[PDB]
Design a protein around this nucleic acid. Sequence first.
DNA 1: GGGGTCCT
DNA 2: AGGACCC
Length: 380
Amino acid sequence: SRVIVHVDLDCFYAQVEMISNPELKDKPLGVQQKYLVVTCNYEARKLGVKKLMNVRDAKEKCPQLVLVNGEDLTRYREMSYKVTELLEEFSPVVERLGFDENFVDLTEMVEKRLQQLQSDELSAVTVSGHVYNNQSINLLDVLHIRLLVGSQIAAEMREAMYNQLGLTGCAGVASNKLLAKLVSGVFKPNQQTVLLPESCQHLIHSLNHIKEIPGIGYKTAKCLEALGINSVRDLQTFSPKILEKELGISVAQRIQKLSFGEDNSPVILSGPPQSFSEEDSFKKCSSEVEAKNKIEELLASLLNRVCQDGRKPHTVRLIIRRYSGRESRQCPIPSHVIQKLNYDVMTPMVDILMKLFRNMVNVKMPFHLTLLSVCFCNLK
DNA sequence: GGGGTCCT
DNA sequence: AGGACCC
Ligand SMILES: Nc1ncnc2c1ncn2[C@H]1C[C@H](O)[C@@H](COP(=O)(O)OP(=O)(O)OP(=O)(O)O)O1
Ligand SMILES: [Mg+2]
Ligand SMILES: [Mg+2]
């Protein structure tokens, strides 16, 4: 049996901004990227603003909305890493999911604490936060005890995140990653909940669409929908044989297990990132001249990042998106270029990126690009 | 939107 | 190199 916590920061980008400019802490705030409000603080959500909503919709429904620009992710990324490092201090196995979510495997920590316990104050063990579905605790049930100690650790985590980084968030504690992530959002914002095993089925059947299961995305949901599968129960009861043939043995067996609340995937230590990338989207790029300036701009940003990181990238990738869905070209970085960080690495790197660009884009015939991205990977 | 992961 | 997933 495992004890897993999922930590999910409240309106992360908005929190980072409200900390940067505390004069926003009291007003409805929205963080904008191009024409989207990607996230907003809880005051704005109260005024009917939704995640990933159009700035037109948002401006009309809530003309008092204060917008800050969140296209440069630098500060969010930096705070994101402070959070996971703080969690890694609790237990070293921490898996990041995007910038604002972490899983921690607490089972070793829980076991250590229980061993230190006397029967005197084992009486006595208490929950911190909400119990999912108001389920009764059985102090004689060792699984219940282990999960409650988890909720205590989770509370210490949220307290340290607030006290040391100024950030609030939710936590969900359960026996695997799927359930911990489903349960962490039951009470929001800035609260936590623990899932006892006999409420597992209640949690999974509380979902309304199979897309709400982590692991089942747009494409997979579409296939399932095609098969007449709509509820969690539908997926639970659909023919394994048929499903296996429709989506392949790997996806079928995995997602069908997910529909019963079963997930044996380990919490993986994320550690340092395996790639660095920067991108810009735009309405139109139809010339190599600006394509180069664009790319130079991105390359500038990236180099600062590999600079302070330490490790060195052994491959570059250039990515594009044409009008009306992405294409990419990569190649190893010349060994001599790799030794760069106090000379002029720009020019030779731009040279390589442009060769890659022309290989993928016919510059002798009109082109219409709508995104450019540069990615460094294969770090050593 | 502006990132990131892993598998095939 | 592309596809699928996550935020
Ligand atoms: N398709 C997408 N789904 C989810 N998030 C996305 C997507 N595209 C970009 N993002 C970015 C923008 C959001 O600010 C952030 C998602 O954070 P998420 O944990 O879903 O909620 P949140 O931190 O905004 O608020 P809360 O956790 O309080 O609901 O990631
Ligand atoms: Mg969040
Ligand atoms: Mg999903």
